[PDB]
Subunit: 237 residues, 4 copies
């Protein structure tokens, strides 16, 4: 039972489980039923960007998704991460396919985290920037169908030799080091994440989406968590 917090980019509306009737981006606290969502004007074949920020002052997690020359989509939710997550965690990217599929490529990824402790008013921090992925990336923990090196890109779900996506796939990419996401004595604590992606699809119904997540350290892909579950949750409850 992993504790999970995520920002999803749902490309397929699973109206059974509370997903609205269109692609959208949402926020997930311990469940695949997003506490808050927002219509996202998904664009197939185009490189997009997702920015996610959070800070220990407003105690608010927000995220923006956009494509060059187009309206951006925003989603925010008030959440006190101190009570939802353990102090040490790991951060990652995650995508899945089901009966429907799409490329779940990641062109770049950046993350910064700062803990400005009470005791000294001296910062603790971590930052990593990936604009190119080496075929043997030793600082990423690839889980599932996640591979690196193809064009300097991170391909989260299985894509064949033809450049075409495979159905029923799941992948996850985690930074090797555990991040100190919060501390009892911190004045301010914050994080900022960004990643550009390319969700291409040869059909008319792409699924299932990508998602930036923060989990307990030893998290692993929940068995059979493909499709609508986006490699994060064991059940749609």
């Amino acid at each position: 039972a992993d504790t999970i917090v995520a920002v999803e980019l749902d490309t397929y509306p699973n109206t059974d489980i509370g997903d609205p009737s269109y692609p959208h981006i949402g926020i997930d606290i311990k469940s695949v039923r997003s506490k808050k969502t927002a219509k996202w004007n998904m664009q197939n074949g185009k490189v997009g960007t997702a920015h996610i920020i959070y800070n220990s002052v407003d105690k608010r997690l927000s995220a923006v998704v956009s494509y060059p020359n187009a309206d951006s989509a925003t989603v925010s939710y008030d959440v006190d991460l101190d009570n939802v997550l353990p102090e040490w965690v790991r951060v990652g990217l995650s995508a899945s396919t089901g009966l429907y599929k799409e490329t779940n490529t990641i062109l770049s990824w950046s993350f910064t985290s700062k803990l400005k402790s009470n005791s000294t008013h001296e910062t603790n921090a971590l930052h990593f920037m990936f604009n190119q992925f080496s075929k043997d990336q030793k600082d990423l923990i690839l889980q599932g169908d996640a591979t690196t090196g193809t064009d300097g890109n991170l391909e989260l779900t299985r894509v064949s030799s033809n450049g075409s996506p495979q159905g029923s796939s799941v992948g996850r990419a985690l930074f090797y080091a555990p991040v100190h996401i919060w501390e009892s004595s911190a004045v301010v604590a914050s994080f900022e994440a960004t990643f550009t992606f390319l969700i291409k699809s040869p059909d008319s119904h792409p699924a299932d989406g990508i998602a930036f997540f923060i989990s307990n350290i030893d998290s692993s892909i929940p068995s059979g968590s493909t499709g609508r579950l986006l490699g994060l949750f064991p059940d749609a409850n």
Copy 2:
């Protein structure tokens, strides 16, 4: 007529104009009557730290002030700086003495700004960190009784050779370069500021406070703006 946005660290309660009956920190939009305030347990003779954050997404300006091993004071206010300030501004510190005084020493001052453009999705940034002040700081625009070099600190208001604070003093320090605080075509835009200070006062009634501020490029201390006016506003209206 300057357009001013500031976060004051009001040490003296001027109940004439709206101040609450205790030291407080507050948010000022074009006026000295804080749109929002919060109780601050002002500690005389001790270093404090102040953090001001803001982001184009929640369009919210928060501020946290604190002392090592004590409670922090926080205040936030929802404000679209896009409709209050011009795109090009300058940032600075300001302080004032009136019938009552205090040293308005500034031990360090850091600032970051980023603009994540839409047309390109690439960042534009600025960052400066002063952990020491030379006696001839050429990147600071000193105004009023503001001086540098004394011990490596920035003395906003007049302090004699005796080290004692002087009444009816005003001082401001502005970073030489104009900051591009916002843009119409930007996806995300954020700034963060931090400074440590030392408000000492021989007596029992210190006044009048420090304030980080953003203003129009050619901002100049309003005439006779000492005391309650904290070198930022001409009138108490």
Copy 3:
């Protein structure tokens, strides 16, 4: 008179003054006659990158120039900047043309400078990054024919609306803030600068070149320093 240090991307060989018989990159210490040079494979029509570094430990100024998938040119010169420059400078870019011309487009520019003090061991620093140039770039001091905003790019030399480069042109762009490039009490001083350029010429002999420079605060384009002088030097001695 001005005190100048520069890294030229000399595209036109001026044998009369010392320029070796081919396009090269060099290190100018107070003279257009480079103290050290290196053959450069100037590619007309391609975006290139230049990286300049220097630290107070090695007391060496190096530079690298490269194009995606190609041999990179390197140049280095041991120089003690303490005895060559004043402690406060200004940094900028400079191009020029003479009888022959080329576009001197600047797609991006970034710069970082740090000062780790002796008296305290706490760093002071400045960082600015430009990935887009607004039509009213208020934090750059434009000199000569230099214009911002055309396509988001910086044009150091005159360029027609057609896109054709023009002869006898001189331009510079300095960052607004004076940089504290070195201090006696500094344990370690260092600066890093990067910038991507596009030198497009319609003819066969491009000229005259781009330059990264550190100068005294009030530097300005010398009289008649077009062509082989690259907006930097008054004479050729």
Copy 4:
């Protein structure tokens, strides 16, 4: 067998293995017999600071060690780390004792690493800054006698509750994630490291010294590498 590059801060002169007759700082390349050294005015009881820098242009590894208001010791060596280390490494701190001892307290540690690629021309970075060490630092791998939490410092070697150091102690602290220290496609690669320490001793001859090292991923304290070997080398050959 380990591949190790280090920068010792030899506090005990082991005249039998190549150590000069006095406290020094050295550059070790696959051996405890420093390729290059320089006298160090080791001050017992004061907080020092060490700064290591390297870049793939000069291919020169430099180190500076200083105390507040005291001369700095400098040492540099021309080494092409591409032919000495594997592309993926781990960086960490090490310290040791033997017949004589000292406390090897690290009050802060910082490290930055950049890779400006040739194929792409966009950087890959990693940065971590420790100003405080929690009692369960999950992003550091502790080996031997290294403990976190005591005061907020990292004791590389055994220290009793009294505060007195102990003989024949050994310990390291590596950063959890592997660093991509270099790549064949890299135009520029560089790293900068900084850490402050406090070497206190109750006697007249402290030993054996602290060291910043870069090793292959799976490195571990070699058997018997206490004393003169500083937890890095199996023998003294």
